[PDB]
């Protein structure tokens, strides 16, 4: 009995959960259309020449 | 987004600007202080009216809020439940020593339905904003102990616009948008008790 | 220099002038960097700081004090301010 | 929200203001005082009419309010229940000593349906604003004891408008909105008793 | 200085002039800071304060009094005002 | 009567929301609780004399 | 030259001036290439670096230090910067 009835420790546990996220986007595009004699040229990003 | 028109030509310069700015703050507090009087070797009470409640096995209780009654017939056994919201405080196994040392299991819980119950609701899925804790603590007559605490924080800080110009300090907002949000939170569960002579 | 919020976990009972008040926490610092404030409200406002002569011991997890004469009797809030940063509070009962 | 128009030009200055201000208070009280006369070794009564009730195992009872009767047929056993609302006071195991010391388990409960029952209601989910407590107390003949208490408080305090101008003290409300709410509550359960010679 | 509401947990029986009235609570303060009011209504209004000479003991969790002559017999409410802050009440029966 | 993933924890702290699920079935009803936000569970916390 | 982020896995307790502070990690480098910073915030900003004379041992998985006089008491963040690259932090309590 004296061993099973002793004081046991009391504790306080701290847990920290941390979460960080970052993004970065960068777009750039030229999209033209030239018309000289007889010719019709169109340049884009989706379709090419 | 720039274009060129080789067939026409505008007159002079026009600028057509538009500004937008917003600021906001908020602050919510919610506090509860509950007492219950009880005995050392106190046992639970089994009334339950046939419904199942999460506080059936508690030696002592105090509630304030609402209560959902659920009666679903089933062939594997009917679902007959009670869900309590608002404030729930449950005490389990409250032994006290001749010194005045109090040992105790405490749950404690604050919750609200996320959206209102409207008599067209079904009991199959309910959303219930919730905060809870449970543990066992020991303290002497008159002392104060923190059972649980929780500190939070968020931030979102978006930004968009022209390349390399929207990122300039100060004047960057002249070439796009900018947005920032911040949140803080604190939750504390504190316990004290005395012996009533 | 002090970025982490101190946490107050336990205080003792009583606190009559001449009694010993023990506080236990986590990031409690130094007696040369921090101070204990009693008599405050839920938000830490108001309240009077303990004199530096009232401190018997000060570790980063335990503070031991001697209650002076002239503290406001009744219930109030106790905080520890470490490097200008306020802790979480506990309710104390001054006799 | 500012804009510029390089093609037109207004005449003079116009201000077109609009003001709004509101204040409100409320205060609800609700009080119950119940007596029951009973004996020391009093047992519960098993009548129940076949329906299940949460106060079946009580040695003594007093109710005032309403009562929902539920009859749902099921293959796992019919759901035949009674739910009482209003005031419910239940007393369990009331032993009395020759000194006059009274030991007792008391529940006590005040609740109301959140929305009215309208004969189109189904018994599958019911909302039931609720406040409750239960514990065991002991006191001598003529004394008064608090079984439970609950103190609450809230606050919301929103604010919105122009950056850095809506936050100025006093004149801040000239550049946006402002709102604040506060709530208090108190719940007390108090017990006394005497020996009837 | 006093931010926490006092809580009244138990009162004794009787309270006839010359009897001893015992009150037990939590944040009850000092006899030099607080006073007991009897004969009030549910809201604490009305009522007469006990004289300071009626106090036998006053801890933060127990007050012992001697009932003077001239209190209003019958049922009424008892409150403790600590530092100007009112407690939760209990019903008392003056004989 | 509901099933929760933190039933076997010695200590807990939560903050967020909670989904209550009541699905009747012939093999046994699905009566569950799903918690979101923050969940912290502690299991078997032995401490030595050191 | 240093591409991999250092990882801080464990720090010891205490950290009073004159005590021994032990740090354990993975890609911690050399005492001639890296430095320990204490008193920083969650993001590594602020804070003061340990002097080179405070280093007792420095492996790629363990750093042993002697706490000098003048560090800011209270809670703060500890980082190791290896070749200009910052590690993951740990919270430390300076006494």
UniProtKB/Swiss-Prot annotation, chains B, D:
Question: Which superkingdom heads the taxonomic lineage of this protein's source?
Answer: Bacteria
Q: Where in the cell is it found?
A: Cell envelope
- Parts of the chain that traverse the membrane: none
Q: Which Cys-Cys disulfides exist here? A: none
Family classification: Belongs to the bacterial secretin family.
The function of this protein is:
Could be part of the type IV piliation system (T4P). May contribute at the cohesion between the S-layer and the outer membrane by forming oligomers. Could also be the main channel through which trafficking is managed.
What is this protein's name? Probable type IV piliation system protein DR_0774
- Complete-protein stretch covered: 544 to 740 of 740
């Amino acid at each position: 009995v004296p061993q099973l009835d002793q004081v046991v420790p009391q504790i306080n546990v701290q847990v920290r959960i941390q979460e960080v996220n970052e993004r970065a986007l960068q777009s750039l595009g030229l999209n033209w259309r030239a018309t000289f004699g007889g010719f019709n040229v169109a340049v884009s990003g989706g379709t090419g020449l | 987004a720039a274009t060129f028109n080789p067939t026409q030509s505008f007159l002079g310069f026009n600028i057509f600007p538009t500004l937008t700015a917003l600021e906001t703050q908020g602050l919510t507090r919610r506090v509860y202080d509950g007492n219950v009087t009880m005995q050392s070797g106190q046992r639970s009470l089994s009334a339950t009216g046939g419904a199942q409640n999460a506080s059936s096995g508690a030696a002592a209780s105090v509630k304030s809020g609402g209560r959902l009654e659920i009666n679903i017939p089933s062939a594997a056994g009917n679902i007959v439940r009670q869900i309590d919201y608002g404030l729930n405080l449950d005490f389990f196994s409250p032994q006290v020593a001749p010194d005045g040392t109090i040992t105790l299991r405490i749950r404690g819980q604050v919750n609200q339905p996320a959206t209102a119950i409207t008599a067209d609701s079904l009991p199959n899925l309910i959303d219930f904003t919730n905060s809870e804790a449970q543990s066992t603590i020991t303290f002497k007559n008159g002392q104060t102990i923190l059972m649980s605490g929780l500190l939070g924080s968020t931030e979102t800080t978006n930004r968009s616009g022209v390349p390399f110009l929207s990122s300039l300090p100060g004047v960057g907002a002249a070439f796009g948008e900018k947005r920032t949000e911040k949140t803080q939170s604190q939750l504390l569960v504190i316990i004290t008790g005395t012996v009533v002579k | 220099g002090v970025t982490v919020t101190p946490v107050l976990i336990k205080v003792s009972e009583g606190a009559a002038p001449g009694d010993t008040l023990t506080i236990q926490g986590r990031y409690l610092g130094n007696a040369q960097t921090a101070r204990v404030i009693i008599g405050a409200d839920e938000n830490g406002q108001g309240g009077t700081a303990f004199p530096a002569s009232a401190v018997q011991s000060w570790s980063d997890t335990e503070i031991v004090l001697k209650v002076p004469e002239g503290m406001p009797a009744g219930g109030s809030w106790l905080f520890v301010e470490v490097g200008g940063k306020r802790s979480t509070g506990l309710r104390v009962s001054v006799r």
